[PDB]
Amino acid sequence: GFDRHITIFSPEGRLYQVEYAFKAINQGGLTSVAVRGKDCAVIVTQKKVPDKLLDSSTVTHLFKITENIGCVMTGMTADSRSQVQRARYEAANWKYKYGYEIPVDMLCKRIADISQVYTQNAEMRPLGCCMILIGIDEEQGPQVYKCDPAGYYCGFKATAAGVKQTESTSFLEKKVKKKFDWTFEQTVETAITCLSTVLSIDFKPSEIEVGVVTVENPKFRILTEAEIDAHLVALAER
Amino acid sequence: LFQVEYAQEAVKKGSTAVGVRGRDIVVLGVEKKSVAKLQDERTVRKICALDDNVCMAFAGLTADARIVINRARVECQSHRLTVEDPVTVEYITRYIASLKQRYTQSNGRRPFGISALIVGFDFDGTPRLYQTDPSGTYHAWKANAIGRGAKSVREFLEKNYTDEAIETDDLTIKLVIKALLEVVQSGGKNIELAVMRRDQSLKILNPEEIEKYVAEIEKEKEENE
Amino acid sequence: HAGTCLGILANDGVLLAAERRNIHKLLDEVFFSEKIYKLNEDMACSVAGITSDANVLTNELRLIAQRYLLQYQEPIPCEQLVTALCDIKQAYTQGKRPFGVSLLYIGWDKHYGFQLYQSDPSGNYGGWKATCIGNNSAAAVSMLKQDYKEGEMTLKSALALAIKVLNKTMDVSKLSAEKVEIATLTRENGKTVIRVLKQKEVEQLIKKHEEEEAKAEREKKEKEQKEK
Amino acid sequence: LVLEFLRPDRQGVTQQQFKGALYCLLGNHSGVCLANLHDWDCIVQTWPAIVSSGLSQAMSLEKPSIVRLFDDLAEKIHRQYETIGLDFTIPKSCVEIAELLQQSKNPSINQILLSPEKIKEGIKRQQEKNADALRNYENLVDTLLDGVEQRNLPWKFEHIGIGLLSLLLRDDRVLPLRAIRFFVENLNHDAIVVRKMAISAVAGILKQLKRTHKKLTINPCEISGCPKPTQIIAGDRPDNHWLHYDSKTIPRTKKEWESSCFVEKTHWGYYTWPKNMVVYAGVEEQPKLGRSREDMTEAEQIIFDHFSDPKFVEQLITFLSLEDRKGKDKFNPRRFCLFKGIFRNFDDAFLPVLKPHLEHLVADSHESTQRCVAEIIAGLIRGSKHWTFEKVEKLWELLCPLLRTALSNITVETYNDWGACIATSCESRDPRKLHWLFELLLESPLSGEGGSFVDACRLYVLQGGLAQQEWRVPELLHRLLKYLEPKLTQVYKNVRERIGSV
Amino acid sequence: GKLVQIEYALAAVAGGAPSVGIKAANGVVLATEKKQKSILYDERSVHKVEPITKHIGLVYSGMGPDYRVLVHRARKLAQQYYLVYQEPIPTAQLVQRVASVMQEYTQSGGVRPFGVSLLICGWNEGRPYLFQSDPSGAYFAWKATAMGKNYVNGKTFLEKRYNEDLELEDAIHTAILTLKESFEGQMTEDNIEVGICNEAGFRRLTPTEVKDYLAAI
């Protein structure tokens, strides 16, 4: 009653609208996984298409904010595209002002500031999308950063966003409890294994979209169906 | 319209004030309410001179009265600037009334909450008396009252106001005293008088100055019996 | 009513008495020492409110005074300064966020001499020979109306009166110089002197009040005995 | 044990333990007060300890929590206090019923009958119990006095102790002498809070001191001499005629004043007469007046001496005249009941001492003076009822100028107070007894010498008095209507309104 | 009532993680728990402690995004002052302005108040300083406080353990004790964030020295 209908404090001090946005992210109905390695970072997520007519190519939840930065979005698609657009804008503005490519942490920070503005202001509903970012930082090497609608942003050795993020995170915690310093193939296998386990799907290569960054090749890249199938078949014979 | 009713009740609560119009004189009287044991009576005026040729008495909320008075003073000066002539009492009345129907910056109590008596001498020299309302309606009067008990005073003014009463300027002053005396039972220092005295600036009466006038009517009251 | 302030007019001067109090032991109290805020050389104020509200109100006031000084190169009159603040606090009333504090103002103006003013939260203001604000303002004004003589005040008598009414009103339960803040406005050599009372002078005044209370206690016990 | 923590003499306790003990004493909003236990043994332990905790040295009154705790203790005690014991004597019938109740043998075990020695032991125990209770009452009173005046105490604790003493007003027994002296001494005290508290206390005391007035029995049919038939119709009747006010029937002499009934209550006689009537027997039967100052025991004596003190009367009068608030002031019926109790108990003792003060007060044009003198004037008038004819004659000779000047000087600030004064003076009194007030007030309400608003306020206080005299003044209402009828067409608005009300 | 939102914001603050401040003679400490929801969360990435200026740093208990907003504003304000006056901002002045913005936001309609309380520390004029700026806009000056969970418990523990004169090391210790009371357990360099203000300037204690201080207990 006027506390849940707008972004204002509950008696216990809680932002129900923000909780509802976190619910909306799961209402979107897709899962994303991110994991970090000594030499690389990767993203995996399912891109199951309901309609045959709908083009598989155009639909993807992986985007390029900059050449060296790749992101994945979950939740409401329109909000995801808007967030992606704003991230692109901020990155270019950063480059223009400061003469060097924005680091992933600063980008996540800016985006979280923007989400903060919506949660603070009543007129705007919180943007119901969650962004995970991968990039290579020269000082710290690969990095993974994740910004919620609320504005909390934190670095992650590995993480998940989606309907099964909880079980995914349990799996990732079990995996990283052992040190398991992962090379590129190991990170890829780890990510796909997390998703295949948590969704119980046993993906075909077309089902999933994969993007990575490497210290050798900082350029963000989207793996093609064939390389994805190579990784999956190497996994299956294991 | 709803704020207007609250404003009208507020001015109804306020201190009584009257004004009279005379041929070479206009008089303005307001009862001086007791303040406290320890307060200083200086700050409270209930009378203001918008210009040399205009005087005002308000009834109602003091702060809103302050705002109105300041705005009207600055308007009086700006009109003098643009027109090079003394402001007309009708004009400044029209502005103060017009100021009521802008509003507060938030529009809260769009009527500011005072009905005030504006009295002055025209540039041609003709005396004028007016009042304003929170509503914004403004009228002219031979004489009037505002504040608590004004209605009873208007009955007294209705009969007492006459060519004979106004024939003498000092009598023009004394009539105001009697009007207040009906309104206020203090019969003394609880009163404030101001007179324009055509072609000269407003001169507030001294406490002794009012005192002798009070004595004179008190004697004349004695003389009738 | 977190705080209390007090003010008295004298023929030769004016003083502000405020209860320097610590809600909690951990509070440093070096920062909160300055209950008295100097608006300018010729004025001061004491606030019945939190330090933040006080800082903002005081800044508005100081800005106003310095603007008047910039225009005219004369120090501002107390009435005009208080009136500007009152007009602002009123305009907030007309926002829906009226100023929630009442202030004392003390100053010397050549036009009116020594003066003491009080500002209501509604924006209305009034001149007082002596008054208190904040906690137990009602008891304070009662004792002042009892113990104050119009025109008979001198700075010394007024100061002792302040100590007395503070002892009755404020909840210190024992006067300490650390626990009370006193400041006086005086005119010396044609210049306005705002001086906080030193801890030693405050201790001396406290001791005078204490011995006077003892001497009074002796008299009442004697008279009570004599009655029976 | 819980009182041990906040004991003053004890040291090393702590601020925290002190606060915890205060919370224990405060208790929850609902349940055992833990400081207002009905037990006499518990209260004597608690209340002195609460007041004595001021000088504990483990108490930081600067603590807002601490001061709010003490205020909460005070408010909770004041609201939840009930009268405490002092007598537990069962009457003879109830023990008979109990004797039957033991005898009933159907759901009963055959316990041996209570022996006479046991019954003697029981009454012995009960007598010792109520005596110990009275002892505890007196001890608590003395102890709280010692607490409120030990010279190391803060003012808040002093105020609290004075309130607690205010609670101990007893109505079975007079208060202890030292306490009565303390309260009457506090009438002139610097703190307004303490002053009002003392006022209410001493008015209660004056009711305690009040000597019972003998009341004779009359037959209303006989005194009237009318037939008084059955199936009587309410209202004015032949039998109620003596009760009805009349100009000819005013006594105007000592003999007639002695002869007059002076029922002093309006409501008797409209509808039907009671079975037994009470009419305040002759002055000889009543308690003596004009006491020598030797007669009074000790409690009346101290009040008498303080009020005889002119410095005391002057200081008290000046304190009453002092304004508490501007525009929010009222009649203060407690101050009124005090002054009535004074004049009633001591029978015109101190009107000579007060007369300078009254003559000064009515002269002053300030509102608060008029308020105080009005309370005093009406308290005096109400006390006057049991006074003899000569005493009241002198009193009204005193009062008439004071009232004339007061009404002439009524104003906007004072009109409500003076109307309250006139109504309270008029209330619960025979009209013939108060004929002076009516003849004065009705002399010229619509004088017009003062002007309008004062003619109105005169009519207003008049209407108040006549309202108090319901159905006992058909005459004087006819007179008001006759005086009023010409002036209907020569009148202003405020007067017209009050004219309609009257 | 707008005040209701202020009360709810204070409750939201009280829900926040513990933050502790102690004012030594020669230095001020600021400490807080930064307990990580999971091992996956990387502690090094984000610091609850952050410096406004070289000589000033602060810590928060409450909503992190609100804290990021306020620290950005404070940094800009201090730099504004430094441009004007070419001297470092005083701690009280900064606290006042930060209170100004908090008060501005809550006063403004259509926007909620900040859900955080800040503890602001600095060293200037050869002196230590400590302040707490609440959501209402009120600022107070303390020798020591705690915020967040069990803040009253921390405050009384501080009251019993405090001394008017103490060294920076002893104040570091008593801060860490205070947090050790509230903390769930297994306190370590990663789980706890520390900063000190002194003549040297504000600095966030590195994990190595924080491990040294923890080992001292």
Ligand SMILES: O=P(O)(O)O[C@H]1[C@@H](OP(=O)(O)O)[C@@H](OP(=O)(O)O)[C@@H](OP(=O)(O)O)[C@@H](OP(=O)(O)O)[C@H]1OP(=O)(O)O
């Ligand atoms: O019969 P009592 O209990 O002794 O009290 C009556 C009576 O009181 P009751 O109506 O309760 O009998 C009167 O009327 P109240 O005002 O008390 O209702 C009167 O008071 P007034 O003088 O104000 O009329 C006065 O009561 P008190 O003694 O409390 O003043 C009087 O008592 P006495 O009969 O003892 O004179």
